[PDB]
Structures are given as structure tokens and as C-alpha cells.
Amino acid sequence: AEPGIDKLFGMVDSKYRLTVVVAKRAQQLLRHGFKNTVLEPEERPKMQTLEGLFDDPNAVTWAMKELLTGRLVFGENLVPEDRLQKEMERLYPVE
Amino acid sequence: GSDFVRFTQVVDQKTLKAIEEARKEAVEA
Amino acid sequence: MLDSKLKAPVFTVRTQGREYGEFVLEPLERGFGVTLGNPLRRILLSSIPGTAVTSVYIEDVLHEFSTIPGVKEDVVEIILNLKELVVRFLNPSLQTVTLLLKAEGPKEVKARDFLPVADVEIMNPDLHIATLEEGGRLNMEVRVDRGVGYVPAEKHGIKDRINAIPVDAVFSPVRRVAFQVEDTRLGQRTDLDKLTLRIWTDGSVTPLEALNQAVEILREHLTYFSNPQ
Amino acid sequence: MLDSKLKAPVFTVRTQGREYGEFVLEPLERGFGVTLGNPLRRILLSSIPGTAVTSVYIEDVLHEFSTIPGVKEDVVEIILNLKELVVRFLNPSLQTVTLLLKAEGPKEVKARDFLPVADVEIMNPDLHIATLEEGGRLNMEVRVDRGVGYVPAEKHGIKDRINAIPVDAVFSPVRRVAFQVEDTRLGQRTDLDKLTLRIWTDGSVTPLEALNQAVEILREHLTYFSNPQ
Amino acid sequence: KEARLLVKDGDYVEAGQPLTRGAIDPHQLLEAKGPEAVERYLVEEIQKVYRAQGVK
Amino acid sequence: SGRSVIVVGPQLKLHQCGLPKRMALELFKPFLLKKMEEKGIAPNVKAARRMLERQRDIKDEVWDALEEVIHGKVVLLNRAPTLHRLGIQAFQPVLVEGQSIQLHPLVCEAFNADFDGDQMAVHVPLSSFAQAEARIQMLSAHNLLSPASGEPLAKPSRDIILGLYYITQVRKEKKGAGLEFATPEEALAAHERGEVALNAPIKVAGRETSVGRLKYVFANPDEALLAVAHGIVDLQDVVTVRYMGKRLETSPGRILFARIVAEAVEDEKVAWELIQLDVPQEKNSLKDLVYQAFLRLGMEKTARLLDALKYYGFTFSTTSGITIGIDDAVIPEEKKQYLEEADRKLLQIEQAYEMGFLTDRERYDQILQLWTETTEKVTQAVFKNFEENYPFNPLYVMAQSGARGNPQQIRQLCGLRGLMQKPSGETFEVPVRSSFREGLTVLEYFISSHGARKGGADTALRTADSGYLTRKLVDVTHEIVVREADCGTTNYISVPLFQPDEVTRSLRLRKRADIEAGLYGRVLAREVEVLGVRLEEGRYLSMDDVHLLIKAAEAGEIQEVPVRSPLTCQTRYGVCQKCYGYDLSMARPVSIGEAVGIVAAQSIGEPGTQL
Amino acid sequence: LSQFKDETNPLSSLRHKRRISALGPGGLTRERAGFDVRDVHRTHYGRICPVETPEGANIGLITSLAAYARVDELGFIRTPYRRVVGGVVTDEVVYMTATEEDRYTIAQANTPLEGNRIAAERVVARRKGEPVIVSPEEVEFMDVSPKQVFSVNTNLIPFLEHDDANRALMGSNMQTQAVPLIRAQAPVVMTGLEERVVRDSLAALYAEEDGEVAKVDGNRIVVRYEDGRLVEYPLRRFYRSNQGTALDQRPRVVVGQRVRKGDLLADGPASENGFLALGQNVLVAIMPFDGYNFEDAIVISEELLKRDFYTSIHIERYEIEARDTKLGPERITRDIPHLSEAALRDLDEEGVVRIGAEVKPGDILVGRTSFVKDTSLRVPPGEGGIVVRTVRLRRGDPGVELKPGVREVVRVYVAQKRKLQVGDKLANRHGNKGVVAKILPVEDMPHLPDGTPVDVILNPLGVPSRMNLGQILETHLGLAGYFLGQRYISPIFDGAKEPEIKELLAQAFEVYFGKRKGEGFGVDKREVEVLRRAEKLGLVTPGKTPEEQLKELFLQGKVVLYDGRTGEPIEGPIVVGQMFIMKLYHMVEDKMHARSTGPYSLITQQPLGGKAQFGGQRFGEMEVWALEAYGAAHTLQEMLTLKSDDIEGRNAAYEAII
Ligand SMILES: [Mg+2]
Ligand SMILES: [Zn+2]
């Protein structure tokens, strides 16, 4: 079903924490434009009829893959939300 | 509904550096 | 070719009419009998194009669910009797043909009763088509086309007449194909195969006709590999 | 073409070594992927000629239920460990090659100790057949013939030596094959065919090469109908 | 007369021991044993039906 | 939301679902317009509305647009009467042609949904987070083990089970001549000639080996594979093949199933290491392997195996050509002798009553016992009949196999369902002496009608009764969830290991399965070095721990267990993991935040349906 | 008390019309206490068929009386019984009162007799609802027939003697839901009442007396009787049912055709030749196919669609009206004010539509405008066939009373020739049910040594759990009748016996393979190998001729088969036969009920469509409970807010998706 689900499980303290993390990352990709990715360039989700999956046919796979990478850091309470969103909005013109 | 998990912000090192400069911004004069 | 090539299936043919035909090929090496008779039967039953009642128009009725006076059979029954008609094309230029028939009174409409046409044959001349009781005005026209296998009336949607109707398509002229791969006994090898393939056909084509047609088709299907990828 | 000839099965291939290979052809029409694999799969498992040890003889060995001192394994084990031994002829004239092997001492005997045959080459020089335990007297000779597919030992009963042993023959260099037709969707229709065949070969050739053979010879079998009779 | 009793005369018997064969009022069970013993009892009768009906 | 009839998805994997397109059409009209405006399909979203409002404005490129949209999308499917957590599950939709809904056949029982006409419904999560949560913990491919009790709910079905049992079964037919080949190879040669003649059947009692193994020796199993391919060897045969380092004397089908295991999961080493290739494959062993493999590799490789198993079992079930026939109902002649025995004994009882010595109760009870005896007599006779006489009885192969059937069904068909109660509940004297292979008597069938009517009535009443009970259960248990750290309460329950009254005074190591049900995945209230293993305090109770401790209790080293319990859980509301313990649909002990009370309500009320 | 009439099939109607229940006004008996009543009283013998009762909550509540039993004067069933005097039975039949029944010893009909005298001294009898194995002289009456024991619907499954009541009731019940087909076939093996069935059930026409045909037109028949008279009877061509089916008496007589008294004239919609004919007889082989015979799934070959072999016409009866609103009467007009006239071509006449046309979902049916505001009828989502009829009762009410406000009324009739499709459902008389799982291209489907392949392949695993051997017995019987090209009459228990079964097996096998031999072909290598393997399993005696051992296999009712896809012969002989299988009521639940967006309630904002849009599906409570079992927090939030009540939120999500 999902690659490295055991690995992500090990890196994730609770299954529901992994769920929340994945969903937060996916909605991040969505809201600020899909460019909110860290492993996109070289390896990337890719479609079948074309390479359309490089963009966002299904974000959740993107979040899972980035989680398989150590690129993202998810804190249950890691940063003040106001400044995190503010810096996301300054540094992402992908909108 | 578990508060222990229900909110867990996901952040990249670039976001960490962004918050770092946001903190550094507090220096006046 | 004396030892092995001469030791090749003797394609022998024994056909009752152009409808039924048997072909015996032996001796056959290990497992070739079924190995070949199977896809041969499959293509015979599947790929062989044929002819069927393409669309139907009754001059008298608008909707298939009606009944015509002095007509014991009903509209759908009649179109069914039409579909059961077996025709025969005599030319590749023979693809679309609108047969017409007009009958009246206390007469039984047979499939021979249609208007004769030049390049066509009524493979079903005696096919009971209808039976008119008294002054039964049965005048109508069926477009018949030369197709492959089956298609529902819906997809083609053929309308020579808006009052004319489509019907599901049946273009396999094969009644049934089988092949008995029985042990043929060769001097050195009794363990040889001898395949006698029997086929009942509609008669529109002769068995060997669809036979070599399918053999042709299959050989192209093989040629799909001269291209490496 | 674009519609239906571009509607041509993609003869896709990816060979994992010369022994294994995936081969996906797609798409296909109704009842074709099986129509192709089944006959072809049958052919590849018996049609393919290959190298198989017809018989073997140990000078001292006179029952296969016997074991050679200085050689722990019994006749059964040595014969089996030689069964998989796959060789490659340099020319069709290598119809039969009998290679002998001499060995004593506390040593392990693999395929390399065999006396080299000019036209015969072993792609399995690493195949360790036995272990000489202490001055183990082994003199052996294996007759191998160029044949097709599988041949049981008893039916040939090859006796180059009256105490030599017939060997079950397996010539088809392809270890085996697995084909399936997966349903594939085109923009218009979803009921389409994609036949994928992954094959295992002894290494005598690459799976692609064996496919080339089988397909060509099958088309040739399709040539057994041109003469009418 | 019908009281089907299992215990014998003279035999020492724990309190709350069912003197007859049949069922028991849960309240008297709690009274004699207090909470935990009644808990164990009831869990037993709950699992007995499921095992009798193959439930795991 | 929507609802309509379903159809099996034998091609479908449970990770997906069989979806006729024309419903997803209306459903995703929003996303469809989104995409086809994402394409040039319509000028605007609303020109799109007009374009798509007609079945005759239909464009095919609508199709690839919709497929592109749904590429990474899933929906939820459910049955009309929902009773448990899996009464709905998440599937990745697959647009299909036709009206009916295509269904992965395995869950045809997870949902108590046959193919008698009942139609199921479906909805969809919409929000990105909502879809994520649905796919994460509501995926069927994610929802494997029963959380009610730790049983897997994906139990393989009858057809696949039968296919694998048939493939992995072995045969033996006859041995008459010299069987004692064990020592003599002259014996092998002579008996091999007798096999050359009719003297030796292949499945003869070959002491060291049946003629099958001596005759044929295979280094690489592809060898025997081809031999079968040449029709040389049947799949249930006694053959020898030099396995990786072993001369495995097996049936072909046994090695082939082992190979199936090998591909389904990469590490074929463990694949054979964890497989009991030495027995005919039965549903119970099926579940055992399913469980252990899920333990070893996890979700993905286990499911790979599950799908491959479904495929191969279907393949082999079809290949078997095995069909039921009236003659498949083999009436053992032993049964007719038992039947004459019972009839003569009943006549004896009746004659003893006739002059009055037996009371109507006395004669009635004597007859009752006589038939209750002869019934098991014939059951045993027919059973033996199967083991030796007809190991390959389609009827017996099935009944013996876990796919379907019971001894009672076979008896009722092969033998007779003789003893049946009257309208009151008392069994009629003259039992049902005929079978279905026999023609039931008019009055006998009339009488048998009564029990069937009672069964229908009480099952129908039990349906609503179980609904009521579950309703109360959820009413009361709904509050309870796991939200806690180690509930420091040093209070546990010592779980007895002995059922002390099976006889009035008979204290005995309590039953194994019950012990597993009560104690699996528990928390050691304190360390216990029982069989030399220091079962430390709080250490969770694995099944292998269950086995160790069952063995110890057989040793009598302990009669109960220091182990935690919710009852001794300190947490005011909620239970400690330690206070609760282990059981999940996954292995590791429960996670904090899990609504355990609901799970218990379901697990308990659902069974009441069949009580 | 009175409601719709059961217009599924004439048999369905008659059963419904001759069945009594317990419940009623309530005082007689209300719903909550039937346990004691639900069990079949002993007195039901010859009185009530205990297998005809509707299963479910109302199980034991409703049943058809004994077929031969009838009310004498006052709701009191008396049943025929063969008088038996001493050792002499009397053909005189006395309809006994249930209470009077206890007064005697009723002998069973199965007992052999030499005429009026029994053929066994020791014979069972029904003294008072008990098996009393007594001398022939101890019976005052003997069972007239097994038929009297049951209602009509019970007696129409041939081999009941080897089937369980649990599913016998199921089959008897499903017998009612049969939809008359385009092609009416009679069972290969029958019970014997289909003639009486179509006789009592007025589906077909019957000639009063002796006479000849004057004229037989598709809608009329003038007969001229031997009495010198002539009378014509209009013939029902297409008449809708309570459920919208066909109603025709099949023209069965040619003009100038001499018909006797009571001679069937035009067989009813579901009669073959004055014979019950619904559903069809199809050659069937039981074998566990990949997954399309999973539990009770039925696998069908393509041919039954190529042939016109399972279809019926479904009739749809729509209707609308114009009202005179105080805001303004709702004119039934052709006008769609705003945008388009193109779709208005179909609405040919003003307000009313043109007749005899196909309809797509959403097509205007009746035009009209409210306050002007466009408010007109359209084609319901789903499927509409071809326009057939219309009725237009405007203010001009000749004898109609259009309701107040109703400015006018209008009725519309469409027809759709529904062919059998993928999702359809079928079952046999012997109880086993199922739904079509897939129709396979007949090209690769398994085929006999003879090219003739079977029609349907079943999953055998069903039968063993079920307790019904009569079905397999019928399988053998129909397989035999196939080559025999002839039918059979099997009384439920007195009918055929397996001895005659094997006789017909030998006869039919001899026919089939004697003509095989005449073909110049005996056994094939495939046959020899399979026969060898049957010997290996002991199914065929080793050493017997492949001819003879194949003959024994035939007498086994099983034979060899070839694959078709891999063409291989099938290991293990398979029993097959011409099975008379019916298509059950494919009720409305079959149709998709799949609505995404559309209407909502008035008082509440819960979505509710219906006539305009399919409608939101019931969500229930325990479903939310299951969601609770999972951690479905925001998905459930969405369901109850974005998909349940919140108009503003639901439209906001609409636009977000947009
Ligand atoms: Mg059901
Ligand atoms: Zn706790």
C-alpha cells in the first residue's frame, strides 16, 4: 500500500501523529501553491499518461515521501503559529 | 481529538531558519 | 522434405456443403494439436466478420413496441425474425444493402419473399418472417451491413429512417468451431498429434473460407513483433 | 497510423540478464493476449531446442543407488547437480558431445575440470558437481545432445556405456514462462488487453532471443496451410 | 424440594458459596464478596456464553 | 451519497473498489468541471455545467480528465445494516462500465453481504484532511485484524481455500506387492518393474519412498513443474526434489504453494521457514500463516501475499474442475449397518415398552439415547470412510477443508438428520430416517418444517434483540477512551490458569483458547520467572508468551497471573495502556487517545446477533 | 386491509389471491405475539402449506392454504382424503374437518396399492398427527395425494423430495416474483399443474367449445364454434402491470383452425403452449470458476444476449398538471423563457410532447411556467424509453374531477425494452438464488467435446451449505432431456427415480456418442488421459473401455469438458443439464440512487431531491458509530456540516471545489 509505512511509523511516535503530520503537509502544499515541497526536483511523484504527478495529482503521496525524507521536521508544538504562517506567506509567492 | 497529537506543525529546516530570523528581528536600534 | 517436413500435417478437407466442414491435419508433434486448435477456434468464433440486420424500418409503425393489424407476430418478434435471417454478400463492395419486402392479405411472409437483389443471396430463403392474416400491409426495409462480430443497436445508431430502428449486430458466420486432437500413430512416434477440426457455419461462407481468413488474421497478429521495443 | 494502427500493441521489453525478462505487449483486442500467450507459452516450453545431458557414466559406478568412496554424495545427488548444468554448442553439428572428467584427492569437482570441447562452451563453469574426499577415484563422461525442451531418461535410454546411465533431457534453455493479460483502458474503451510475459532462461540465450525463435517458428507453423488438400 | 445443592454436610464452605445449583442474585454476591469477586464472577458468565457460542 | 446493487470484483483488489463511472460522474461534477476547465473542455465552469448536464453532450476526454482528477482519490462504502466498525470501509474508486457495483470478493463476509439482492451505499470524504484521515485509518487494506478481538477479519474464502487445499494435497491409491524397498535397491528395481507392470501404483506404500520418488528426481523445482507441464506428473504426487539443500519428498502442489509464498514476499528464506509445507492446506493453517506473515513483514508484503493467494487459489479451484454430483454424496455402507443396528435396538425398546415394563418416559429416554449414540456412531464411520476410503471426496474434500460444511451437513445429506424435536421442543420418537439422497417422506418433511420455522422465527427475533443490546452497549460504554500514562495504581488481577470445577471438584489447567482470549497481550503485574524465562513486570504478553505460560501451567508452576486490568486501572475515566494492555488491530499495544469503549460495545453486541 | 394486486405473473397473482394471514384489524391478532402461532400446528396437515409463509418479521403470519383444501362453509378448511374401508380403499374423497380429522387414521398416499386394496400390511398412517405404523385395516382415510398437502405454489418444484424446507420456502416465494419474459419456456422437468395453472390463471385464452377459427388478428380473434355461432374476443397486445410489464395473450391458433371446447386460444404473457413458461431453460455446468461464482454469483455465457432469450418491456407512467396559482395559473406551455429553444423541438405540441420517441435524462416532459417563471415537466433521471401514450384532461373534465387548484392534468406513458444486463439476478425453482456476476465472451468459455457449450456456470459451494438435492436431480434430468429432446412430468415425491435416471442416462449417452462415432471419432487423447485420472481417483473402473467408462461417467451425470481459453479438457467430470432458471424481481433497489448536488428540505436544510435529483442517501446513526470507532474527526465533521445541514458551508465547499 504505502512505501516505508513501517519506517515512517518508526519515525512517528503515534499513528495519529503521523496522520496529522501528513495532512498538515498536504494542506501546506495546497494552500501556498503546490511548491511547498523539498524532494520534488530529482525524484518526484510521476503520473502514467504523462509526468503530471510531478505537480499534484495526489499531495498525500508527496507528504509521505517528504516524511520518508528527513527534509521536513514536524513538531506537535515546535514554532509560534503566527510567525510560522507569516514567514510561510512572505517566503512563498507560490500562493 | 487527542490534544497530544491533534496539532503537530510540520516544518522544514528553511522554515526553522525563517523563524530564526523572525526571532532575530526583535533587536531594536 | 521427406523425413520431417514430409512428416507434416496433411491438410485434408471434407466439407458438407459450404456450411459444415472438417479439416484433418497430422501427424502433429507434441502438444501442437490443441496448441493450435484452441486459438484457431477462438479466432473463428471471434474475429470472423459477417453480416447482420443493421437497422429496420417499418413503413407502418413508428415504435418497435407496436402491433400491425392482421399481423399475428409483433414488431419486436418480426425484427427478431429479421435478425435470424442469414444473407450472403457477393462483393466487398457489398457492405450496406437495404432489403425491402411488401406482403398483403392471408399470406405467410418468408425470407425468400424479399425483393431479390443482384449481388446478394438469401442464405435464409425459407426463413419464416411473418404471417399476414387479411390485407396485412407489411411493407418495410432493413438496412443490412457487413461487419465484424457484435455491436449493440445503440452504439452505431443507424437511421436511414427515424422511424427505422437499429438492432444489436451479429457478424460471426460461424455456428460452432471445435477440434479433436486425437493421438495419431507415426512409424517412429505413435505419440503424434492429429487434429480434426470440425466447424458448422451459417453457410454465408464456406468453413475453409473463414478458416484461412482467421489464419491470415492470426499471422498478422504474430507480425506485431517484427518491431522490437 | 494514429487510430487503430497506432492502436498497435507496444512490443515492450526489459531483460533481466539473459535468463530472465519482462515483455509487455499492449494493447490488445478482445481475446488476444491469451490467444497469443497460451499457444506461444506452450511452444516456448517444448519448441525451444537446447543442450541436455543425454547420459552419463562413472567408470566405477554401476548402480545409481551406489556411492563412490572419497565422494560422499550418491549417484542421485551427482546426477541432479549435473541436471542443471547448461551448456552451449558452437554449431548444430554439436548434436552429441561426450565430455569426460578425471579427478582424485580431497578436492571439489565443478564444471571447469572437464576437458574443454572446442565447439562446446559452459556458461556454468561455477557449477560444483561433487567433492573428492580423499584420493576420490572419479572417472566420468557425460553425453549431451542438442534437442528441444524436455526428454525423460528412460525413453532415450542413451547408453554410450552399457553401465552408463540414461539422463532425463531438458533442452529448452528457458527455465519457464509466465504470461497474463491485464485489462487496459483506452480513452474510449476500457476493455483492452495487455499481455505481459516474464520468462526464465538457463542462460543459453537471452529471453528476448528465445521469444524471437518461438514467434518465428510459430509463424512458420502457420505456413502449413498454404497448400490446399 | 427441587433445590439442587452441590455442597456436602460438614464440609467447610467459603462465604457466598452457592449452596444450591442454579443462579444467584448479584446483590448478594457483591455483599458476600464485595466488588472484585463479583467482577470475576460476572466476567466468567459473560465469557461462558461466548465460548458456548464459539465467540473468541 | 448514493446506493445501489453490488457485484464481485474478483479482478479488484481490496485496496481499490469496483465503481461504475456514471455515479462518480454526478458525484464529482464539481471536480469534473474543475478539471475540464483545467482543460479546454468547456469555456467556463458553467458552460461546463451545460456541457455535462446532457448524456449526449458527453465527451470522451471528460473521461481522462476525470481519471486524472481521481488518480489519487478514494471513497467510502457501506452495507445497509451497519453493526461494527468495518460496516464501512475506504476504497480507491475505479470507474467501470455497467450498472452494478464491483466488489472485492474477500470482504463479502466482512460485510455480511451475500449476493441475494441487497444493495450497498457509498459516500466520500471531501476535505484534504478529511480524505487523508479516511485513507489512513479507514482503509480496508489498512484495517486487517479484528479489533473487536484480535482475530484477522480478512479470512480467506471458500473457493481460494479449496483451491489451495486441493493443490497442496497428496494422493495414495494402492500397494499390494513388495512394499519394503527401504533397505533393498533390488527391491526398488523389482517394484519399479511392477510399476512398469500394474504391480506398483505410483502412490504405493514405498518404505523409503513410493515408486514416485524413486522413479523421478528433480534438482530444480521448475523441473517437476515442467514434468507436470508435459502431463508427466500430477500436482498431488509423491515426488522428491533436491531443495536448496534438501531432498524434499513432497507433492508438486505443496512446493508450488511454497513458491507462491516465495514470490508474494521477497524473503523466500522466511517464506519456507514459516510455512508448514508438510500438511494439506486448511483454512486454519491459512489464518495462522496470514497472521505470522503480517507479523513478520507487515501490511504491504502481507497484502501482496493475500492478493497472490486469492489469485492462485481461484486459478487452482478453476483448474480442479471439481464439481458436486449426487453420487458425490457417498453413503458409507457402515452407515446402513449402524442404521440397522439402531432400528433393531429401537424395535427392542418398543417391544419392551409394549408389555409395559418401560414407562413412556423410560422408553422415550431409551430411544433418545439409542439414536444419540448411533448418530455419532455413523458420524465416526463416515469420517473414517473419508480418511481412508475417499480422501478426495468433493463433498468430503470440502467438508474436511475449511471452505465450507460441517459434519452435520454431510450427515443430513449423506446420512440423515434423524433426531428432531417436536413443536414443544421434544424430539419425535421415530427420527428422520431418510436423507436427501433419499426422498423425504411427506409426513416426515411436514414434521421437519416445524424446526425450520422455529429457527427462522428465533433468528429474526434475535436480530432486533441484538440491535437493542448493542444500542444499550454503546449507550453505556461510549465514554471510555484511552487517555493516560502508566496508571500508577499497583492493583491488578491474578487471572486463574485452572478451571477448578469441571467435575464437582476438578481443578484443572483452564482451557487453552479461553486463556489466550483472557490473557493475550496483557501486562505483567510483576515479573515472573516461570519456565526459566524472567517474565518481567509489566512486560506485554505476546502469543508466544501465552504458549510458554500454557506449558508452564501444564507444569503447574503457577495457577493465575500477576497482570493489570481496567478494573484495577486508576485512571478516573479512561484506562492505562498498562491498565488496558495490548490488543489492537495492529500488534503493538493500544495508542493513547483510542475510543476503547466503543470498540468493546461493538465487539460484544455484534456477537449477540447469533446467540 | 386491501391494497395493490400482485401483478407480477398470473401464478404470483393467484398465490396472492389464495393466501390468508393472521393479522388484521388487530383484535384478531396483532404483530407482537405469534411465536406460538408461527409454529405450524399439526392441524395444518392438508390444511396449510407451512413452506409458503412469507419469511421475515411476518414469518408464520401469512400462508397459502393446502392446494386441495377448501373452506366448507365458514373459514373452516376441509381437505380431500381417500376413504379406505378395511383393506379396501375407496376412491371417494371426504373433505374432512380438522377436528373430525383426529377421529380417524389417515393413510399416506405413498403406500403402494393393488387398486382399492393396499399393497402393504404395515403402512404408516396419520392417526392424530402422528406417524402410526399400523395395518391397512386401521386407516379410515388415506392421503388423496401429496398435492393436497401443500398450496399451489408449493407443488411447482419437481424434486422437493431431496431439498430442505429452509430454502424450499425461499424458492416457492421467489416463484411469485418471476417477470414474464419475451420468450416463455416451460421447465425441462415439470410438476404437472402448469396446464391447470394457466387454466385457473386467465393468462391465455381458451376456446369455449368445439369450433373453428374465423379470424386471428393481432388484437382480436373471431372464433366460429361447432354450435354454428361465432364470437370474437379482443386480444391484449401490450398492457401494463401494477409494476409496468407486458400483458399479451400469445396468438396460438391459425385462422380456420379447429379448436375444441376449453381449447387454449392465445397463451398468456408467461405461457409457452398453454403451459407455464417464464424464465428460460439453459444448459448449465456447476464448477467453481475463478471468482464470478463466488458465493451465489452466476456466470453467464454471452449467447443468451445474442439470442433474444432474457428480456422484458418495462412500462413507465409519468404524470403532471397545471394549476391556477393565486400568483398566476401555471400554464402548461412550451416556453423556456431564459436561454434555449433547441430542446423544445421535442415538446412538439404546446405543453404536451410528441409521441413515440426516445428520452434522455433531464428531457422536458410537460411544459409549464409559474410566476412568468419557467416551471415544466422533464424526463426523470435514470432511464426513459420511447413515448407510447398520453392523456390530456385539461379543465375539459368529461367525467374526471381534477383536484382544486389543478388547472389541468396530464398522463404520459413510456416503454423501455429492458434486456438482461450485468447486474440482473436469477434463481432456480429448487431454491438456490443469486445474481449475475459476469457474462463472458462465449469464444473462450468452456465447451463440450461437442462444440455445444453450456449457458451458465455456478459456484458449487452453495449447494452443500444448502440442503437441496432436487436441484442436482433436475440438473441430471434436464441434461438428459437435452439429447432426448423431450420433457418429463415428475410428481413431487411419486415422480422419477434414479433408476430411470440412469436408464435415460444410458439412452442419451448412447445417442450422443453413437453419433460421435458416426462422425468418425471415438475418444480423444484428452478423454483417455482424463479417464485414466478418474481411475486414479477410482471414479472410473480401471480396465474398462474409454467408451464404456465414459458411458458410466455419463450415467454419473458427469462428463469431460474443454476449456476454450486454454481449450484444455477439465479434470474431473461435471454434472450439467438444462435447468429452468428464472429472473427474479429486479426491484427499484437495482437502480442507482446517486445524487451529489440538488434540493434540500424546507424546514431543514438536509438535502432532499427525488423527482428532480436522485436524492441524498440515508446516513443512519450506527454508521456514525463506526466512524466513531475510527478516528474520523474532520471527515465526520464535514459529513454532518458540509454534507448534512450547512447550506452556507456546503455551498462554500462547492465554490472552493469550483
Ligand atoms: Mg443478502
Ligand atoms: Zn490506567
Side-chain angles (χ1 to χ4, degrees), chain G residues 280-458:
Chain G
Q280 309 287 4
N281 293 90
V282 299
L283 276 182
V284 54
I286 190 167
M287 183 278 288
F289 182 76
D290 291 331
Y292 314 94
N293 53 335
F294 176 87
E295 274 183 291
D296 291 304
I298 298 89
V299 185
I300 191 66
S301 172
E302 295 294 328
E303 164 52 38
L304 297 197
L305 62 83
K306 296 183 289 294
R307 79 188 53 258
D308 61 357
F309 184 76
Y310 279 102
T311 290
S312 181
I313 190 167
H314 187 273
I315 317 176
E316 301 75 69
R317 205 211 192 240
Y318 297 122
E319 177 176 312
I320 206 176
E321 302 94 23
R323 291 168 270 160
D324 308 285
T325 73
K326 318 194 81 173
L327 299 185
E330 287 173 318
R331 54 211 60 70
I332 301 299
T333 175
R334 191 163 157 157
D335 186 296
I336 295 88
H338 177 205
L339 284 169
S340 66
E341 183 66 26
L344 286 51
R345 304 160 290 81
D346 314 328
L347 183 63
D348 186 74
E349 70 266 40
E350 183 65 26
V352 176
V353 75
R354 54 205 300 271
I355 297 89
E358 190 276 332
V359 294
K360 254 56 165 183
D363 292 331
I364 299 314
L365 292 184
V366 168
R368 175 180 42 75
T369 61
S370 84
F371 281 57
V372 75
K373 183 189 176 35
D374 196 353
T375 53
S376 310
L377 171 55
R378 309 158 188 273
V379 170
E383 161 56 350
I386 313 303
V387 176
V388 301
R389 293 179 66 189
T390 57
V391 182
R392 184 176 179 179
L393 309 188
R394 314 249 172 198
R395 295 294 85 193
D397 317 315
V400 65
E401 68 275 16
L402 282 71
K403 300 290 94 176
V406 169
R407 174 183 185 174
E408 86 183 35
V409 299
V410 65
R411 284 189 183 160
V412 175
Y413 282 58
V414 65
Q416 42 188 274
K417 181 175 73 175
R418 278 172 195 172
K419 179 68 174 67
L420 201 74
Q421 73 104 20
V422 65
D424 313 328
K425 74 164 55 170
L426 321 173
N428 74 97
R429 303 179 281 173
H430 276 280
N432 173 33
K433 201 158 159 293
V435 166
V436 171
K438 185 186 177 311
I439 190 166
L440 277 296
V442 65
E443 61 86 19
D444 59 343
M445 51 66 68
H447 67 300
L448 183 63
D450 173 1
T452 187
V454 285
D455 313 278
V456 298
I457 53 168
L458 309 186

Side-chain angles (χ1 to χ4, degrees), chain F residues 201-263:
Chain F
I202 297 89
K203 280 72 177 175
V204 161
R207 298 286 72 76
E208 281 326 300
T209 62
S210 179
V211 65
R213 283 82 59 84
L214 182 63
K215 209 158 178 175
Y216 320 104
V217 189
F218 308 85
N220 189 358
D222 44 8
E223 293 179 353
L225 295 174
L226 303 205
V228 186
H230 281 237
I232 313 298
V233 285
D234 313 328
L235 185 63
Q236 307 73 348
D237 293 332
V238 298
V239 176
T240 300
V241 163
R242 184 262 293 154
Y243 183 52
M244 64 183 73
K246 278 73 69 178
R247 308 188 163 204
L248 292 196
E249 296 197 67
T250 62
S251 178
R254 297 263 182 120
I255 301 299
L256 162 66
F257 153 78
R259 299 286 75 78
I260 284 169
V261 175
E263 72 273 15

